[PDB]
Amino acid sequence: DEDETTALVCDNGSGLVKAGFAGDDAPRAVFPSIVGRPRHQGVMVGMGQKDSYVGDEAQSKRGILTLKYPIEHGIITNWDDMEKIWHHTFYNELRVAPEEHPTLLTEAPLNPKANREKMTQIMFETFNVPAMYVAIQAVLSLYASGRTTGIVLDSGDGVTHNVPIYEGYALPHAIMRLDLAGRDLTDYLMKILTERGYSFVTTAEREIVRDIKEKLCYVALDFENEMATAASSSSLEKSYELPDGQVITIGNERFRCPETLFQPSFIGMESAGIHETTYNSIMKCDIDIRKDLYANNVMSGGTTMYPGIADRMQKEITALAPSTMKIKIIAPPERKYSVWIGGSILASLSTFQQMWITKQEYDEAGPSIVHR
Amino acid sequence: EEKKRRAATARRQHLKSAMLQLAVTEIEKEAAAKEVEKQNYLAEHSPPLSLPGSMQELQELSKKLHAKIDSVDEERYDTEVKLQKTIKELEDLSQKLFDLRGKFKRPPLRRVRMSADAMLRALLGSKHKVNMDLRANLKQV
Amino acid sequence: SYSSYLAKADQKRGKKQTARETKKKVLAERRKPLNIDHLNEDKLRDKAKELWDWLYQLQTEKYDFAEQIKRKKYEIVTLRNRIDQAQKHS
Amino acid sequence: VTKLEKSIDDLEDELYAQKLKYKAISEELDHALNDMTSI
Amino acid sequence: VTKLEKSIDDLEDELYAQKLKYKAISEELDHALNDMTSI
Amino acid sequence: TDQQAEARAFLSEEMIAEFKAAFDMFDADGGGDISTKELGTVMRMLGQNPTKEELDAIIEEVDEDGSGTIDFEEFLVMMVRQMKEDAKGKSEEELANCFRIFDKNADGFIDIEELGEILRATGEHVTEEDIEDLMKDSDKNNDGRIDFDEFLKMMEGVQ
Ligand SMILES: [Ca+2]
Ligand SMILES: [Ca+2]
Ligand SMILES: [Ca+2]
Ligand SMILES: [Ca+2]
């Protein structure tokens, strides 16, 4: 129990932090990855002067603060502001003292060696956690779907990745990163919806375009004869009621937004798209492992939640793969937390105890120890 | 204003302790009795051996035993496995409760290291006089 | 749901067959032939009992493993009641 | 032929197992889609 | 042998069709049991 | 150091006295702290066989000064945590057992009937009102029975 209860799992994202206790089924804490700094001197009624704001209080009060994102494209870019988000996570969100809890953290696919050593330096030397561990994100997603070999298409708020994993070892030279994700996708909907003849003028109009994207957006299979369908004008249309009455209608654009993930050309991106990239990762891997990867395309991440994403991907890679092959696109329902759940499982596991980096290992080996 | 109510509670305690006190003394009864059953069971399934004559008997008996050994051993094995299965079933249940409550009392697996009382005895042998449990110590008279 | 029937066969048969040989491998090791046959006469005496003890050895363990499962089986019954009691979907 | 006949019987049997394991999850389904449309 | 090999390939193909037609309804399921436990 | 406080606050001179004698034997050279090696020796004398990883973890559990060694203070802390855990385990075990004795019908519960029996089984003099009263006070989920959890709670304190 000492640490059975006690292991923490913190998944640091570009848009959201997911956090909680190893053992739980889902994150106890989910909140924006921002750190707000007040543009002016003054106070809220009853509070003192605050130097900084994190998560939702930074989002809610955004009009008087300069908002900053510590993690650009999955990589920690500002370490002063990240130690601020961690502090908030332990002390306010989970309300635990960190110096008696083992902490499993996550990093990104080709996270620079030096960063994995730096967050270890900050975990052990400024938070004084007993022990910690850094798992790679795609690797926890895979594992949370039971398996050990497969290829994960991972897509969240600032990055998309393909991480081919074989008997647990993520394959460095076959990993692909596509910098277009849910953030890019909300801003494109924004324009095709203002372009539908609308105005997201106040900040209460801006924010909810993102809630339109999440609730009403679709990834149609045969996106071709779906536009064609749009035109005959079926009961395909969908009206959402705004903060007030102002019933906005979205028929068609509803799927023009996730067609951006297959066609980056919709947004002036010259890069290849999700399905081709799944494939290219795969023809960059060893030959003998390619049947395995093909029958185990695990999807994880908030942006892979658009319904019919899996069917489109299913047919997208069947028709690029040699017919002798078995294609299989696994997309679980909890996928917006796969990464986290994979960490919860792993860290609560009976056999993981012997991989925890302890302060004994650290004080004796330097940050190098956990770096592997 | 329920001034007397205080005595009611003390009773439950007095009784609770009358219960536990009862428990403990019954606990060792069942324990020893249990053992008794164990030596009787063994009493017949493998009674005080009596080596036979000399020729065919010793050889025969030996063959008899040796075969039974593979027999009992197999049974011993099957049993060990049904245990494994069981311990497994309760570990999972010992989970379905954790992430539904948290750390709860009396986990079935119990990861225990040796007690400090043990280590102390082990290391100082003779001079280890402290029936440690919890009782703090503050100046007597 | 009948496409999962082929899963039953593969799965069950698989695991069961895996378990078998293991048990065979394991049990085989713990077995040293009755090689000693007609090498001495009083040998049988000092031998027979040793086998006897080994048997008694195993027997006694089997009894313990047994009583153990029973105790565990009860741990379960209780651990299940704590699970239901701790349900309250409220 | 004996090898392939042996592999056909294992796949055809793994089969009625799969085909049946489903009628159950697809039927648990019309059910588990109807109560949330109702609640 | 060619007759039985032809019948093994039809059952093994009717197969990945069944095994896959499901990952879809069992996954449409964890989903369609999660939103009513939430709504 | 804050821990080393209550820790020493917890123990008695007697305790410290012995825990010292014990600590001294841990410490070979007699310098002032157990090293990753000095510990290994004692562990084996104690009948274990830890690995480098295992040892350190056991060390840096009470190494507040990131020394990589244990001083008679960090040690007392360690003894304390143990003393604690030991006593907790022994307690829950006993109660656990008591529950099985009181249960006997093995339904995993203790119904007003058994509660009466066991109670009446004590020497003490009791009338039904007492029994049903203790039931009503113990049964928090008001289901009639007393689950292990409740039993832990109800016996919480009692000796
Ligand atoms: Ca020393
Ligand atoms: Ca020290
Ligand atoms: Ca009962
Ligand atoms: Ca009750």
XYZ file of C-alpha atoms in Angstrom, chain D:
39
model
C -3.840 -32.447 -47.589
C -3.972 -33.851 -44.000
C -2.157 -30.688 -42.776
C -4.613 -28.341 -44.584
C -7.687 -30.409 -43.574
C -6.447 -30.130 -39.935
C -6.024 -26.328 -40.360
C -9.535 -26.053 -41.973
C -11.240 -27.801 -39.022
C -9.431 -25.554 -36.454
C -10.429 -22.311 -38.328
C -14.054 -23.512 -38.912
C -14.297 -24.358 -35.162
C -12.557 -21.115 -33.937
C -15.463 -19.929 -35.930
C -18.719 -20.867 -34.719
C -17.012 -19.718 -31.468
C -16.449 -16.191 -32.922
C -19.856 -16.031 -34.813
C -21.623 -16.917 -31.528
C -19.475 -14.859 -29.079
C -20.902 -12.126 -31.097
C -24.757 -12.588 -31.195
C -24.350 -11.931 -27.520
C -22.308 -8.577 -27.775
C -24.460 -7.274 -30.753
C -27.651 -8.085 -28.714
C -26.173 -6.660 -25.475
C -25.844 -3.731 -27.832
C -29.349 -2.888 -29.182
C -30.072 -2.953 -25.453
C -27.141 -0.817 -24.318
C -27.986 1.720 -27.040
C -31.735 1.890 -26.205
C -31.495 2.760 -22.438
C -29.239 5.946 -22.985
C -31.519 7.137 -25.780
C -34.186 6.747 -23.068
C -32.381 8.367 -20.103
